[PDB]
Symmetry: none
Subunit: 207 residues, 2 copies
C-alpha cells in the first residue's frame, strides 16, 4: 500500500517507512490526496483507520515553517488523544529538523503556556478550546497565521454548546484562507451540518 | 512507574511521561541514577537500549542554564545520529522553553555556525570533532564553561588517530570539573582504556 503512492516529500516518506506503515486504510487512501492539496475535509472513521495520521501527514506535508509563527492548530476533547497527536507529529517529522509542536490541554498556571509561546514558539499547537481561547484572548497565542484548523473527536466538542461557542470564537480569530478538517469515529446526522458550517465545499467521507 | 522513580525535576518528568515513555531499558535503569549525580560513564549497549536518552535526560536534569554560554557538549560519528540526538533534547526539554540546542556537523560554511553562536548561543551543542574544533580554534565557540562532555559512537571516533587527536584537543579546552560520558553499541577491549583516559573513576556498563 503506497504511502509512497501519495505525493509526499522525501523526508516525510522516510519517516513513514521508519514507523512501519506500508498500508493506508481506505480512509487514508481517499483523504490524504485531497488533504495534501489543502482541501477541507469532514471525516467519520472508526478506530484503527488512522484519522490522526491523515491530518498529521497532510499538515506536515504542507508546512511552511516560519520562526515564531504558529501555522497549525489542532483541538480535541480527550487529553490522552492530544498527546498521542503530538507523539504522531514527532514520529513523522523525524527527518524534518526544527519542526516544533506544543500541547496546551490544561495545566495549572497559564503562565507556563505563555512562556513556551514566548521563548520557544511552536509551529504546531494542540490543545483544548478553553485554554487555547484564553491564550488567544490575552494575546500570548497569535492565531493570525493559522493555515490549518483541525478538530478531532469533533462531535464531542461541537455537540456541547459551551465548547462549540469557544471553538467558534477561536475560529473567528484565524485567517479565512486556510484548510479546515474535522474527524471523529461518530458523526450523527444532526451534527454533520454543524461541522460543515466551518468549511468550504469539503470532501466528505463517512464510515 | 518507569521514569517516575528517577528523581528528576518536575518539568523533566512531565515531558517524559507526556511523550509516552513508560519503559526504561535495563541500561537506563542502571546509568541514569548515577549520571544524574554527575558521575562519569562508559557504556556499551545494543541499538534500541536508549543510550541517547541516558545522557539527554541526565544532562537536562543537571543543566544550570546561563545565557550566552554552552555547558553541554555532545559529539558523535554519524550525521544522522547527531540530528536525532537533537530531537531527543527538544522532546524532553518540552517544558523547559529557555533551553536551546544546536547542531554543527559541518558540510557548510563555518561562518554560518559562527552566526549562531554570536546571536543565539545554545546551552547544548551537538556536532563532529572537526567542526567543533574549528569553531573553538577561531574563538567562536567558548568551551570554558562545559560541564558535560559526551561522545556517542565513541569507538568509531577514538578509533581514528586523527579524529582522536581532535577530540583530545577539544577536551583540553574544557574545565577539569565536568562530567564525561561515552556511549557506543560496541566497545572493543582495545579502545576501552582509551575511553577511560578522559574519565575519573567512571561507572562502566558493557551489555
Amino acid at each position: 500500500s503506497g504511502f509512497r503512492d501519495f505525493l509526499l516529500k522525501p523526508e516525510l516518506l522516510r519517516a513513514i517507512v521508519d514507523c512501519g506503515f506500508e498500508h493506508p486504510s481506505e480512509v487514508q487512501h481517499e483523504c490524504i490526496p485531497q488533504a495534501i492539496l489543502g482541501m477541507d475535509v469532514l471525516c467519520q472513521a472508526k478506530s484503527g483507520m488512522g484519522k490522526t495520521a491523515v491530518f498529521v501527514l497532510a499538515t506536515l506535508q504542507q508546512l511552511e515553517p516560519v520562526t515564531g509563527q504558529v501555522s497549525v492548530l489542532v483541538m480535541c476533547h480527550t487529553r490522552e488523544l492530544a498527546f498521542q497527536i503530538s507523539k504522531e507529529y514527532e514520529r513523522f517529522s523525524k527527518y524534518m529538523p526544527n519542526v516544533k509542536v506544543a500541547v496546551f490541554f490544561g495545566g495549572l498556571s497559564i503562565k507556563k503556556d505563555e512562556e513556551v509561546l514566548k521563548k520557544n514558539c511552536p509551529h504546531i499547537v494542540v490543545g483544548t478550546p478553553g485554554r487555547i481561547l484564553a491564550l488567544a484572548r490575552n494575546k500570548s497565542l497569535n492565531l493570525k497565521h493559522i493555515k490549518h484548523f483541525i478538530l478531532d473527536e469533533c462531535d464531542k466538542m461541537l455537540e456541547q454548546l459551551d465548547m462549540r461557542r469557544d471553538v467558534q470564537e477561536i475560529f473567528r480569530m484565524t485567517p479565512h484562507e486556510k484548510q479546515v478538517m474535522m474527524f471523529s469515529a461518530t458523526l450523527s446526522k444532526e451534527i454533520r451540518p454543524v461541522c460543515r458550517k466551518f468549511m468550504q465545499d469539503p470532501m466528505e467521507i463517512f464510515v
